Amino acid sequence: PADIVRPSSEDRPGLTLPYIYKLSADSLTTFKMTAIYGADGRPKVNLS
Amino acid sequence: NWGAAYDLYNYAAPRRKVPQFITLFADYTQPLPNQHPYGAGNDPLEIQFGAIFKNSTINPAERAAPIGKDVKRILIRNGSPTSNERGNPTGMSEGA
Amino acid sequence: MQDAITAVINNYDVQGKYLDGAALDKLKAYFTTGAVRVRAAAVISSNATTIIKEAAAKALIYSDLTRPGGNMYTTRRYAACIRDMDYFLRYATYAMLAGDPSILDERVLNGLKETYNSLGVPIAATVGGIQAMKEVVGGLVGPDAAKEASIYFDYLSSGLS
Amino acid sequence: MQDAITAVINNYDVQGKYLDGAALDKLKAYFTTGAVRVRAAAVISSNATTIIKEAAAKALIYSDLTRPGGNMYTTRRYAACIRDMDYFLRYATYAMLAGDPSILDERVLNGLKETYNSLGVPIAATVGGIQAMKEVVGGLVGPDAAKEASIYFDYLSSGLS
Amino acid sequence: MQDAITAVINNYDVQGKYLDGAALDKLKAYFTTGAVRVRAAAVISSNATTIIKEAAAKALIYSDLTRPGGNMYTTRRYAACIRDMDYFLRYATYAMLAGDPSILDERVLNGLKETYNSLGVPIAATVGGIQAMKEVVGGLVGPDAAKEASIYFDYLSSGLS
Amino acid sequence: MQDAITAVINNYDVQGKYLDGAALDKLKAYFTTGAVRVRAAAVISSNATTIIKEAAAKALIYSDLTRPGGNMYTTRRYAACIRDMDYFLRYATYAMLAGDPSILDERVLNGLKETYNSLGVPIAATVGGIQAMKEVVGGLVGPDAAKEASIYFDYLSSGLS
Amino acid sequence: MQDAITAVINNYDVQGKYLDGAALDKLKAYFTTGAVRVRAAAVISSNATTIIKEAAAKALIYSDLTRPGGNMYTTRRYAACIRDMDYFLRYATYAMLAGDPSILDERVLNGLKETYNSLGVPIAATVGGIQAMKEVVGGLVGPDAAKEASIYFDYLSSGLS
Amino acid sequence: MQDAITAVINNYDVQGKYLDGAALDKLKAYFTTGAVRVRAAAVISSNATTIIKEAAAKALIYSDLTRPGGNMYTTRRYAACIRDMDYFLRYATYAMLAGDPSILDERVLNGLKETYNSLGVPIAATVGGIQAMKEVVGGLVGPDAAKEASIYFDYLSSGLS
Amino acid sequence: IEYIHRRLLGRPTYDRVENNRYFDIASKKGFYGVVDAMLNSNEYQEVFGEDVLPYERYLTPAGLSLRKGRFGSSDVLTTPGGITPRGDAARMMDKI
Amino acid sequence: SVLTKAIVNADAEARYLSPGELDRIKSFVASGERRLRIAQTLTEARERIVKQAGDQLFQIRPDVVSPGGNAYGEKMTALCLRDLDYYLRLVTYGIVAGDVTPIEEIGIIGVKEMYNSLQTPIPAVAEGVRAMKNVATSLLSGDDAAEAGFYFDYLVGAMQ
Amino acid sequence: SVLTKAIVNADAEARYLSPGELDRIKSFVASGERRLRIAQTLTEARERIVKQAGDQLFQIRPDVVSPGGNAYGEKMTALCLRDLDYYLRLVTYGIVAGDVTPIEEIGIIGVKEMYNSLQTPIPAVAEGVRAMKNVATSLLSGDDAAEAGFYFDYLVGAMQ
Amino acid sequence: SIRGTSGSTVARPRLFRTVMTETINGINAEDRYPNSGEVSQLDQFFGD
Ligand SMILES: CCC1=C(C)/C(=C/C2=NC(=C\c3[nH]c(/C=C4\NC(=O)[C@H](C)[C@H]4CC)c(C)c3CCC(=O)O)/C(CCC(=O)O)=C2C)NC1=O
Ligand SMILES: CCC1=C(C)/C(=C/C2=NC(=C\c3[nH]c(/C=C4\NC(=O)[C@H](C)[C@H]4CC)c(C)c3CCC(=O)O)/C(CCC(=O)O)=C2C)NC1=O
Ligand SMILES: CCC1=C(C)/C(=C/C2=NC(=C\c3[nH]c(/C=C4\NC(=O)[C@H](C)[C@H]4CC)c(C)c3CCC(=O)O)/C(CCC(=O)O)=C2C)NC1=O
Ligand SMILES: CCC1=C(C)/C(=C/C2=NC(=C\c3[nH]c(/C=C4\NC(=O)[C@H](C)[C@H]4CC)c(C)c3CCC(=O)O)/C(CCC(=O)O)=C2C)NC1=O
Ligand SMILES: CCC1=C(C)/C(=C/C2=NC(=C\c3[nH]c(/C=C4\NC(=O)[C@H](C)[C@H]4CC)c(C)c3CCC(=O)O)/C(CCC(=O)O)=C2C)NC1=O
Ligand SMILES: CCC1=C(C)/C(=C/C2=NC(=C\c3[nH]c(/C=C4\NC(=O)[C@H](C)[C@H]4CC)c(C)c3CCC(=O)O)/C(CCC(=O)O)=C2C)NC1=O
Ligand SMILES: CCC1=C(C)/C(=C/C2=NC(=C\c3[nH]c(/C=C4\NC(=O)[C@H](C)[C@H]4CC)c(C)c3CCC(=O)O)/C(CCC(=O)O)=C2C)NC1=O
Ligand SMILES: CCC1=C(C)/C(=C/C2=NC(=C\c3[nH]c(/C=C4\NC(=O)[C@H](C)[C@H]4CC)c(C)c3CCC(=O)O)/C(CCC(=O)O)=C2C)NC1=O
Ligand SMILES: CCC1=C(C)/C(=C/C2=NC(=C\c3[nH]c(/C=C4\NC(=O)[C@H](C)[C@H]4CC)c(C)c3CCC(=O)O)/C(CCC(=O)O)=C2C)NC1=O
Ligand SMILES: CCC1=C(C)/C(=C/C2=NC(=C\c3[nH]c(/C=C4\NC(=O)[C@H](C)[C@H]4CC)c(C)c3CCC(=O)O)/C(CCC(=O)O)=C2C)NC1=O
Ligand SMILES: CCC1=C(C)/C(=C/C2=NC(=C\c3[nH]c(/C=C4\NC(=O)[C@H](C)[C@H]4CC)c(C)c3CCC(=O)O)/C(CCC(=O)O)=C2C)NC1=O
């Protein structure tokens, strides 16, 4: 399922990684927080 | 920038104060520097009596250069310029 | 990066010289080979995948390299290796179009020797992978372009060794 | 340099303290392991050459490292590499006798990482050469001394990486 | 990092060996101690703060270290020191769960000796802070787990000296 | 250092390749220009002093450089400058004989930019002294050798700027 | 960073001393010169651009430095150079207000010597650019402030050489 | 190095000027103070040891500096420190005879600040050792010479800070 | 080794060939071995004879620029052929 | 060049040169022979272009060669024409490459800061360049004069 | 080469090449095609030379392929002939270079230390190297066989 | 060719995921010690 390609700029090269190559490594913890909605005011956050 | 980037990612990255990317990118495009055949940390400070030498662990600023084996270093003569010996082979017998 | 033409412009700019006869002769020597460079790039690009497959077949696989203990063992590493091969082919095609190897230094060779030492990637085996792709390329592009394509593969391979 | 005993003396000297119970306990913990350190050093010294040979055989040669393009290609560089190996073995034997790693910092590790980067010497491959000599050493010296010898090889190898 | 189950796999993979009887015996030797490792981690985690407090009280504070001129003088540095202590405790708990010290090298010891030399952080005093936390830990976790927890504290402390 | 014959060997040795057709073609391209290189060196050597004199006259003296406040003021410094000029001429003659610029890097350019910055030696003025000697050389050596001599003077001068 | 006053506070804090007579005398020696430092900073700030222009005119331009082959050739590099000049002037004004050079080390000198060696930036020429700005500054600020401004320009310039 | 007289000669030599009225006035201003410089040097030289002892007594010893943890603790370091003191005294005597501080830069200050940072040598404490020797010197040499000796001690001490 | 060379033969090493000669003599013979090469070289004898005491012969550019170089360079980098106005105001004043 | 602005662009996406992208790499090649010729022609008459540019400039703006003018005097005028010689040179470079590229790095990026320091009136430098366009353009065929003119108007544009 | 060895003398005395130095480069290069033919013939028969060298060696000293011998076994033997293949290669390099610079850096400096470590018996190795001379020399004309023979005897010399 | 270097390191890249590592790597990214629930998972895995 494709190679993840990481896009550059006029100064540095575009590179790609084989997809299965990142799938055999530790899988990335990430932290995200909401998008805030629209019912009344601000997010809520609607998180725990 | 593999090697340098790996250092930047360490948690000891802020213990180094000399810049490393601007200095690395500039080196790539210039001729070899004059430093010792091994590191930049390998030649001592030139004062009267010490044996001074920078540390590595102490406030790290490593700098290496791919240096050949046939590279011969340019050294200034503590004396008159034309007795340099690289251009005048018996310049150590002339005068003082 | 620089190509044939900007190599000359920057060499004169640092002297603040208008282009003179010697400069103009160099640029002609580039322009006069230009159409042939383009045709050669279109052959390489459109045969990219076949060149890698024939180069790997002659110089990498059916070997200890692809067996357990070998650096191109595992689908992960086999993929990384032929990924690399595609870089080399693609950039050599850039260098040959530009008529200047400077891009091979700036975007490919810089730090690569030590990167390979650090991962354990076998250098000599990678050079053979480069010189096998050259062999295939030189057949496909023909008399017109063979020598000109070849040199940037040779630039790549003496850059690692 | 410092050993177990002078490590304690200098730690107290800077406080101007006579040696107290805690100090005296540390020094005992060294003296009580001392005879075993000596026997272990005599085994390593007298098997020096065989340890290097078996460590190189498991971790360095029969490889791309010894082939053209490899850092231990040429009799010159092969000689330099096993020369290095002898340093490591010999100094680790000093550290283990002293019961202090300070000599490994002062006379072996300081600047060595960058020296190897500057020459192109493969760091990861050198660590394997260290951890293979440890493996051999731990067999030869026996239960008595195995853990104590081992740590200064491990000190050396995390000093490079 | 690696753990006992993982190390057995990578140690065999580089030889391309199926897991065989010797491998299977090693893995059993880990699994058979596994439940005890978990219980021990739950004691350490839930007594974390008290272990640091009792370890500092026996081995760091009430001393020149906490007085003007001392490295753990100032609330800033006192905070940094017991912050460090928490790292050690926490990672040793990881190493002991994994049954492998490799994480202590990768994420704790690498460069730390020189980092401490560069800031002036007293190494010998830090080791005593490690060996005091071990002492407390060995009481809290009981016969089942005492020896197994202890070794990764000892790994940490010979990693600095 | 390396020369065209030697470079072909070391560039192939790192790949462990026999010399093949591409290699043999390169070496021929050197041998076939060899007699002309020799004749050119004999002209330069035997006109050495006149080339420096005419190059200094067009590009250095009769100027602020030779006046008080100028870097080639004093018989001492005037002597050092034309001494340098002789180095450049002599080494460029080596590079051109060898058909390889590697000697100009190893024994002339390495550290020279900073050496000149440290003494205050004017770089731009030195380049003009190089490109004036090239101009004279290209007249004296004739059609046969003009382009080949010229490049190593151009190598020298873009090595400083 | 530190100033006169925090230099004293931190020197006593490490000894855990309340400020004594010697300390109080030092701080007075700063406060008593304070109003004059402020007036001097307002002159420098408001004449910033003119100081750079007169300093460049006496010590940099109308020279080989601004000509092809020179480091301040190209509008790019001329801009970078007088940009630098503004840094020096601005920070020296900070150091002089603070009555402490520590900021010149932390935010200006650290690594700068080697940065300039790596880019080829002429050190001796940069020092003259510093000592020319000092000359101008000492005229503009008057008897009151001349010596005090001057020292931090001298700090800067012996920091590079 | 340079003295009063050669300072003037070299300042005119770079302009290629014969000595004019302004030059001749400067040299007179030196010669006219010359006999007094000599007498002052003979007092300093012959009281060398007593000046160091009284300067150390007022500004260094009876303190934390000479106690465990202090930089002039150990007979080794106490000896190194008063050795240094003798250098300062001796060179300041040279500078004052020459009527030029250039020798204090060339042979004493160059790199010394960083040398002291690298060893841990306390800079502020060393300055007090310099300004205490000045105090003693100014008593011993009398009205004639007091101001002239004093300045080169002040040159030394603002060279470190 | 690098520091010892400066003291016994007055200059820094030029090369890696030279540096390596000693590095691989020190590993078989020690401190003593290394000292005895600097002392027994052909170069020692040509230069220092047998009555002269060794002296400092060469310096590196970094080392030279710390002896001098504080205060920058006083000079102005002149150029042959430049158009410059320096000193014309002064000449004009004398004429007036 | 046209090439630089181009092989580097099809490398920010990791691919080979697009079949349409080797066509801009075709017009320029044909153009380059003509482009090289125009630069040579400009180079031949450089001294005449500069000098006549300099007269055209000082009529249109006599204030720069007046008591409080940046170019007042014989050697403040000599440097001014030398700068006009610099920019004509860069214009020949721009024409030949087919892309302005190198000229920007050599003589417009940083030019505001340089001339502000020297206190040179920038817009009268732009006039000196228009003056050179007028002279240079009178030594070229209609078609070549236009092709040259784009690069003159660029420099005029960048000093703005 | 002759060039590398000689130019080095030029640069070290800060001078252009001598008439003598120029003459030897000329005589040397004239002897090029012949040297290339000598290398070709030997490259073309490498497998035969090695194998027949290996038989000649083990008769003159077999013990190495016996229970307590360094080369005892199929893969301990696969390495001894491989080393003989290495040295024949270096001999072809030397012949085309006209001196030993390359032969020396690649395979004699450090060779004592390497083989002492491996406890390969080095002196047996010299005899093995000598055998290759005998085979190679039988595939070359008298004149070319002598020219080749100097380089074989050098390696034999360096070993010991 | 090759005018400068930044050196090399000792990279250890991951061949495969293996549960002990996934759990442990996961805890680090949050810097915490095993959760009360999380401890159980090691037992089943140890348990089998
Ligand atoms: C000719 C000009 C010249 C000078 C001035 C000089 C200074 C100098 N002082 C040094 C060390 C030192 N300098 C001191 C000085 C002091 N300790 C204190 O606490 C006081 C603040 C201060 C005395 C007032 C000490 C204690 C050391 C020893 C540091 C060590 O143990 O390594 C060293 C290191 C080498 C050695 O130990 O001898 C040098 C080179 N070297 C020179 O060639
Ligand atoms: C074998 C290769 C090699 C080279 C090329 C070399 C150059 C070199 N030039 C030097 C100095 C110098 N070089 C020059 C050169 C010039 N002055 C000018 O104004 C002109 C622009 C230029 C001549 C065209 C001058 C004037 C000095 C003396 C600087 C001083 O007074 O210290 C020095 C300092 C030591 C000495 O004075 O001899 C070296 C090492 N050294 C080497 O080993
Ligand atoms: C453990 C996970 C894993 C697998 C399985 C793997 C396979 C793998 N199979 C290969 C080739 C090959 N594999 C096969 C055949 C087959 N393969 C099959 O799984 C079938 C049983 C059979 C077809 C019926 C053939 C014929 C080739 C030669 C490649 C070619 O077509 O030229 C190659 C190229 C190198 C080589 O020749 O060995 C790899 C890397 N790599 C991995 O990391
Ligand atoms: C744009 C220019 C560019 C290049 C050329 C490049 C090379 C490159 N090759 C890599 C790894 C690698 N390279 C190879 C290559 C090979 N394996 C073999 O056995 C053969 C000898 C050879 C193929 C012919 C392998 C197997 C790895 C994986 C090493 C690992 O497992 O970590 C990596 C580490 C990161 C990654 O795994 O992707 C880089 C950056 N990166 C770049 O940005
Ligand atoms: C007393 C403490 C001490 C140590 C440890 C030391 C190491 C050291 N190793 C060196 C080179 C080297 N080191 C090696 C090592 C290796 N090659 C490989 O491929 C392997 C990974 C590895 C062996 C396991 C090699 C091949 C060189 C030669 C590099 C060159 O050709 O310049 C050099 C450069 C000078 C020389 O060549 O002798 C030093 C100083 N020097 C010291 O003074
Ligand atoms: C200058 C910055 C700074 C501060 C403030 C500081 C405080 C400090 N207070 C301490 C103990 C202590 N501090 C207190 C203080 C109190 N008990 C109470 O109930 C009251 C609320 C409070 C008095 C107002 C007590 C009772 C101890 C002893 C606690 C123990 O030993 O467990 C200790 C440990 C003993 C030692 O080694 O010195 C430190 C370091 N350290 C510092 O570096
Ligand atoms: C995740 C693994 C990891 C570890 C272990 C780690 C240690 C570490 N300890 C540090 C400082 C420190 N460490 C201490 C430790 C102590 N002071 C003492 O006197 C005692 C002997 C000791 C406590 C027992 C102190 C006081 C500092 C502050 C030094 C300073 O003021 O700059 C710093 C410098 C950055 C900072 O201040 O936070 C690091 C990175 N960093 C890491 O990323
Ligand atoms: C202060 C140290 C110093 C000295 C002495 C010096 C001399 C010097 N004499 C020169 C020329 C000259 N010098 C002479 C001198 C003489 N002709 C004769 O036959 C007589 C023997 C002699 C007069 C007594 C002549 C004729 C020239 C012109 C030579 C030429 O242009 O080829 C030049 C080149 C012209 C120039 O650029 O100035 C210099 C630099 N430069 C210095 O920096
Ligand atoms: C190739 C890129 C490039 C350019 C363009 C450049 C220009 C440049 N113009 C300068 C001066 C000057 N330039 C001018 C120009 C003018 N006066 C006017 O009023 C007119 C508007 C204008 C003429 C059309 C003048 C009058 C000076 C002298 C200013 C002074 O000395 O203060 C100087 C300082 C003198 C020197 O050291 O050369 C530089 C560097 N430098 C470069 O590297
Ligand atoms: C551990 C190594 C070490 C030693 C030994 C040492 C001795 C030492 N003895 C001192 C003074 C002194 N020491 C003495 C000792 C004596 N008076 C006599 O007549 C007797 C012969 C002798 C007693 C047996 C005296 C009287 C003074 C005071 C001298 C003065 O103040 O002028 C001082 C200066 C005072 C101070 O700041 O502490 C030091 C540093 N320092 C060190 O670091
Ligand atoms: C091109 C320069 C060069 C040479 C020559 C070289 C030789 C060399 N010979 C080796 C082994 C060997 N070489 C031999 C050779 C012999 N046994 C005998 O008794 C005979 C005297 C001799 C055959 C004539 C043997 C038997 C081994 C195996 C020794 C062992 O494994 O312990 C090895 C270690 C195996 C390996 O990793 O390749 C090297 C590196 N390496 C080099 O880089």
Cβ atoms of J155 and J87 within 8 Å: the answer is yes
Q: What domains appear along chain C, each with residue ranges and CATH number?
A: 1-161 (1.10.490.20)
Cβ atoms of E34 and L48 within 8 Å: the answer is no
How far away, in angstroms, is I68 Cα from ligand 3 center?
69
How far apart are the C-alpha atoms of C20 and C6, rounded to whole Å?
A: 15
For residue H47, the tally of other CB atoms under 10 A from its CB is 17
Residues of I in contact with F59 (CB under 8 A): 80
DSSP β-bridge partners for residue A18: A3
N residues, chain C: 161
Mutating which of J2, J5, J7, J11 best tests the C interface, going by the most C Cβ atoms within 10 A? J7
DSSP character string of C114-141: HHHHHHT--HHHHHHHHHHHHHHHHHHH
Residue (of C136, C134, C126) closest to C160 by Cα position: C126
How far apart are the C-alpha atoms of B38 and B45, rounded to whole Å?
A: 16
Cβ atoms of J157 and J51 within 8 Å: the answer is no
Cβ atoms of I5 and I12 within 8 Å: the answer is yes
Pocket test for ligand 3, best of C67, C71, C78 (most atoms within 8 A of CB): C78
Alpha helices in C32-99 (DSSP H): 34-59, 75-98
How far apart are the C-alpha atoms of H5 and H30, rounded to whole Å?
A: 8
Indicate the SS3 state at residue H142. Answer: coil
Dihedral over alpha carbons G89, G90, G92, G95 (to 10 degrees): 170
| Sign of CA pseudo-dihedral J105, J106, J108, J112 | positive
Half-sphere exposure of H59 (CA within 13 A, CB side): 24
Which helix or strand (DSSP H or E) is residue E22 part of? helix E21-31
Answer yes or no: do G53 and J118 touch at CB < 8 A. yes
Q: Give the residue on H whose Cα is nearest the Cα of D17.
A: H68
How far apart are the C-alpha atoms of B54 and B77, rounded to whole Å?
A: 24
Q: Which amino acid type is present at position F66?
A: T
Residue (of K151, K144, K135) closest to K94 by Cα position: K151
How far apart are the C-alpha atoms of I47 and I59, rounded to whole Å?
A: 16
Cβ atoms of F91 and F104 within 8 Å: the answer is yes
Angstroms from H92 CA to nearest CA on chain D: 34
Give me the residue label for tokens 């700063």.
Answer: G30
Q: Give the residue on J whose Cα is nearest the Cα of A12.
A: J12
Give the distance from CA G51 to its chain's centroid.
Answer: 13
Answer yes or no: do E13 and C68 touch at CB < 8 A. yes
CATH number attached to the domain at K1-160:
1.10.490.20
Residue K63, burial from CB neighbour count under 10 angstroms (0-12, 13-18, 19+): middle
Half-sphere exposure of C125 (CA within 13 A, CB side): 23
Phi, psi of B77, rounded to the nearest 5 degrees: -95, 130
Measured CA to CA in angstroms, residue K159 lies from B52, I28, K58 at distances of: 43, 21, 19
Cβ atoms of J86 and C15 within 8 Å: the answer is no
The structure was resolved experimentally with: cryo-EM
Cβ atoms of H156 and H88 within 8 Å: the answer is yes
DSSP β-bridge partners for residue A3: A18
How far apart are the C-alpha atoms of A16 and F157, rounded to whole Å?
A: 39
Measured CA to CA in angstroms, residue K69 lies from E60, K65, K120 at distances of: 62, 5, 9
How far away, in angstroms, is E108 Cα from ligand 7 center?
11
Q: Fill in the DSSP letter of residue K17.
A: P
How far apart are the C-alpha atoms of K152 and K89, rounded to whole Å?
A: 11
Q: Which residue lies with its CA nearest to atom 30 of ligand 10?
A: H57
How far apart are the C-alpha atoms of D121 and B38, rounded to whole Å?
A: 12
Angstroms from D69 CA to nearest CA on chain C: 5
For residue E62, the tally of other CB atoms under 10 A from its CB is 10
Q: Give the residue on B whose Cα is nearest the Cα of C114.
A: B3
Q: Which residue lies with its CA nearest to atom 31 of ligand 1?
A: H77
**CA J35-J37-J41 angle, 5° bins:** 120
Angstroms from I82 CA to nearest CA on chain J: 10
Pocket test for ligand 11, best of K79, K86, K113 (most atoms within 8 A of CB): K79
Contacts of H117 (CB under 8 A, 6+ apart): H123
* Longest CA–CA separation in chain E, Å: 61
Phi, psi of A18, rounded to the nearest 5 degrees: -60, 140
Give me the residue label for tokens 């007091």.
Answer: H146
How far apart are the C-alpha atoms of K99 and K96, rounded to whole Å?
A: 8
**Residue F81 annotated as binding site:** yes
Considering every ligand atom shown, identify the ligand nearest to the alpha carbon of residue F54 and give its number: 8
DSSP β-bridge partners for residue A16: A5
Cβ atoms of C52 and C112 within 8 Å: the answer is no
Are chains E and L in contact at 3+ CB pairs closer than 8 Å?
A: yes
**Residue F74 annotated as binding site:** yes
Answer yes or no: do B34 and F80 touch at CB < 8 A. no
Give the distance from CA I85 to its chain's centroid.
Answer: 36
N residues, chain G: 161
Q: Give the residue on D whose Cα is nearest the Cα of I28.
A: D83
How far apart are the C-alpha atoms of E42 and E39, rounded to whole Å?
A: 5
Phi, psi of E19, rounded to the nearest 5 degrees: -70, 135
Residues of H in contact with F69 (CB under 8 A): 14-15
Answer yes or no: do J12 and A9 touch at CB < 8 A. yes
| Sign of CA pseudo-dihedral F148, F150, F155, F156 | positive
Dihedral over alpha carbons G118, G121, G124, G130 (to 10 degrees): -120
Nearest-10 crossing angle of helices J74-97, J122-137: 60
How far apart are the C-alpha atoms of I53 and K36, rounded to whole Å?
A: 54
How far apart are the C-alpha atoms of J120 and K13, rounded to whole Å?
A: 52
Residue (of B38, F25, E1, F40) closest to D118 by Cα position: B38
Give the distance from CA J114 to its chain's centroid.
Answer: 17
Q: Fill in the DSSP letter of residue J137.
A: H
How far apart are the C-alpha atoms of G134 and G51, rounded to whole Å?
A: 9
How far apart are the C-alpha atoms of E89 and E37, rounded to whole Å?
A: 15
Answer yes or no: do B71 and F106 touch at CB < 8 A. yes
How far apart are the C-alpha atoms of H132 and H136, rounded to whole Å?
A: 6
Pocket test for ligand 7, best of E81, E90, E153 (most atoms within 8 A of CB): E81
Query: Strand ranges (DSSP E) for chain B?
Result: 76-77
Angstroms from E5 CA to nearest CA on chain L: 8
Indicate the SS3 state at residue E112. Answer: helix
How far away, in angstroms, is D5 Cα from ligand 5 center?
32
Q: Which of residues 2-41 of F touch I (CB under 8 A)?
A: none
How far apart are the C-alpha atoms of D7 and D26, rounded to whole Å?
A: 10
Q: Resolution reached, in Å? A: 2.8
Partner L contacted by D127 (CB < 8 A)? yes
Three-state SS for J64-125 is HHCCCCCCCCHHHHHHHHHHHHHHHHHHHHHHHHCCCHHHHHHHCCCHHHHHHHHCCCHHHH
Classify the phi-psi angles of A44: left when phi > 0, otherwise alpha if psi is within -120 to 50, otherwise beta.
left
Nearest-10 crossing angle of helices G146-160, G34-59: 50
Half-sphere exposure of C93 (CA within 13 A, CB side): 31
How far apart are the C-alpha atoms of G139 and C111, rounded to whole Å?
A: 52
Query: Strand ranges (DSSP E) for H5-101?
Result: none
Residues of F in contact with G123 (CB under 8 A): 117-118
How far apart are the C-alpha atoms of D109 and D70, rounded to whole Å?
A: 23
How far apart are the C-alpha atoms of J93 and J97, rounded to whole Å?
A: 6
Residue (of B42, E157, G9) closest to D26 by Cα position: E157
How far apart are the C-alpha atoms of D156 and E12, rounded to whole Å?
A: 25
Measured CA to CA in angstroms, residue B87 lies from B92, C126, F11 at distances of: 12, 44, 32
Partner I contacted by G131 (CB < 8 A)? yes
How far apart are the C-alpha atoms of K69 and K62, rounded to whole Å?
A: 9
E121 lines ligand 7 (CB under 6 A): yes
Residue (of C45, C68, C65, C69) closest to C57 by Cα position: C65
Residues of B in contact with F76 (CB under 8 A): 80-82
Kindly state the tokens that stand for H59: 């500004």
Phi, psi of F144, rounded to the nearest 5 degrees: -45, -50
Indicate the SS3 state at residue A18. Answer: strand
How far apart are the C-alpha atoms of G13 and G1, rounded to whole Å?
A: 16
Please identify, by atom number, the ligand 6 atom nearest to the C-alpha of residue E72: 43
Give me the residue label for tokens 């015996």.
Answer: E25
Partner C contacted by E118 (CB < 8 A)? no
DSSP β-bridge partners for residue B76: I59
Cβ atoms of C124 and D67 within 8 Å: the answer is yes
